[PDB]
Amino acid sequence: GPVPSRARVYTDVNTHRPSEYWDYESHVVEWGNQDDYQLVRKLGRGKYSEVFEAINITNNEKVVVKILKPVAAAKIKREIKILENLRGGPNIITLADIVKDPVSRTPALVFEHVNNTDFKQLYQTLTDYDIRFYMYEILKALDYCHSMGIMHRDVKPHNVMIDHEHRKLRLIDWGLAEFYHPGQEYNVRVASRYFKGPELLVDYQMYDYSLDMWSLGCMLASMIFRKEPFFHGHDNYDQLVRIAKVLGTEDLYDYIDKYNIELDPRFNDILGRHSRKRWERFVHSENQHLVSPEALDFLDKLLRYDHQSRLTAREAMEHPYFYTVVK
Numbered sequence: 651g652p653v654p655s656r657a658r659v660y661t662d663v664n665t666h667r668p669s670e671y672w673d674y675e676s677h678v679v680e681w682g683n684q685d686d687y688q689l690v691r692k693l694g695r696g697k698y699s700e701v702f703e704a705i706n707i708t709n710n711e712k713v714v715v716k717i718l719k720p721v722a723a724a725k726i727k728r729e730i731k732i733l734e735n736l737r738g739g740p741n742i743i744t745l746a747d748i749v750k751d752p753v754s755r756t757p758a759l760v761f762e763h764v765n766n767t768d769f770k771q772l773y774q775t776l777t778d779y780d781i782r783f784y785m786y787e788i789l790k791a792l793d794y795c796h797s798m799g800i801m802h803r804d805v806k807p808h809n810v811m812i813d814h815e816h817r818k819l820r821l822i823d824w825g826l827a828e829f830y831h832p833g834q835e836y837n838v839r840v841a842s843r844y845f846k847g848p849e850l851l852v853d854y855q856m857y858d859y860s861l862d863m864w865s866l867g868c869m870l871a872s873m874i875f876r877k878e879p880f881f882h883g884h885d886n887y888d889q890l891v892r893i894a895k896v897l898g899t900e901d902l903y904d905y906i907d908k909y910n911i912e913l914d915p916r917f918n919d920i921l922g923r924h925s926r927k928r929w930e931r932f933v934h935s936e937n938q939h940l941v942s943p944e945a946l947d948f949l950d951k952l953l954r955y956d957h958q959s960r961l962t963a964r965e966a967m968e969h970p971y972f973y974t975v976v977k
């Protein structure tokens with residue numbers, strides 16, 4: 651069957667920790683007071699939660715209240731434990747409180763409010779310097795969570811709140827996040843279609859932090875080439891075909907060979923044969939200002955089929971693409 655794989659960094663971070671750190675099921679929640687928060691307006695709804703803008707009446711500060719639905723069940727404890735483990739980390743959303751919602755009867759997470767500018771309006775209007783600056787800020791969050799033994803598993807533009815006026819960024823929505831344990835097989839039904847790594851698309855379960863680096867690569871490609879999204883699949887199968895039209899089929903078949911993966915036979919009639927395209931094929935008069943040799947070299951090292959071959963978050967922070975960003 652498939653050959654096993656391990657992360658090449660932060661491999662055994664959880665194994666050395668007391669079970670209290672990663673055994674989220676045994677965690678005991680410290681409940682705050684629901685009366686401290688007044689709901690102001692509904693912001694949105696996910697498949698597992700409802701999100702509201704609210705006011706913390708004990709300091710008149712704006713907050714966000716995420717009311718979890720029952721569908722989460724046992725997974726609610728995992729999100730709370732991850733948020734508490736990561737609290738204070740660079741560019742990680744701050745969990746301010748956990749209260750019991752009176753109406754729902756399920757847990758409500760209270761977060762610091764970020765005055766965000768919508769990604770459809772924003773991440774496609776940034777200058778070359780701002781793409782580099784915000785990417786560097788997202789990498790600080792990813793290196794922190796990976797160093798803490800956690801994979802986000804849902805990196806995408808909707809999950810990055812940016813206050814552009816204040817040049818501040820937060821990585822949010824830790825509801826799919828998981829603790830990395832070497833040798834563990836994980837669910838491949840994570841991340842959003844356009845940001846799913848090839849390991850998810852070929853049903854390889856022993857993935858790691860490097861999944862977040864593929865998703866980050868997809869975001870970078872969309873910003874530098876001004877294409878939303880970069881890999882525009884119609885479903886999870888066509889998603890892999892879209893990737894193969896760019897990266898080629900030979901390196902895809904080499905990846906499947908290396909990990910001894912059984913590729914779903916439905917790919918035999920749709921993948922075709924493709925060669926890797928040079929990154930300059932995606933450059934045009936509208937996006938040429940955002941493209942440099944350093945941006946293309948960086949993107950090339952994130953968008954690799956072999957998850958073990960992608961840059962780690964710390965290696966990405968060392969890349970020349972970021973030499974122009976004030977540190």
Ligand SMILES: CO/N=C1/NC(=O)C(Cc2ccc3ncccc3c2)=[SH]1
Nearest residue numbers: 696701714761762763764822823824
């Ligand atoms: C389906 O989105 N579920 C979420 N998960 C989070 O962690 C959120 C956190 C968050 C944190 C700060 C915000 N600030 C303003 C608007 C939305 C904000 C959202 S929303």
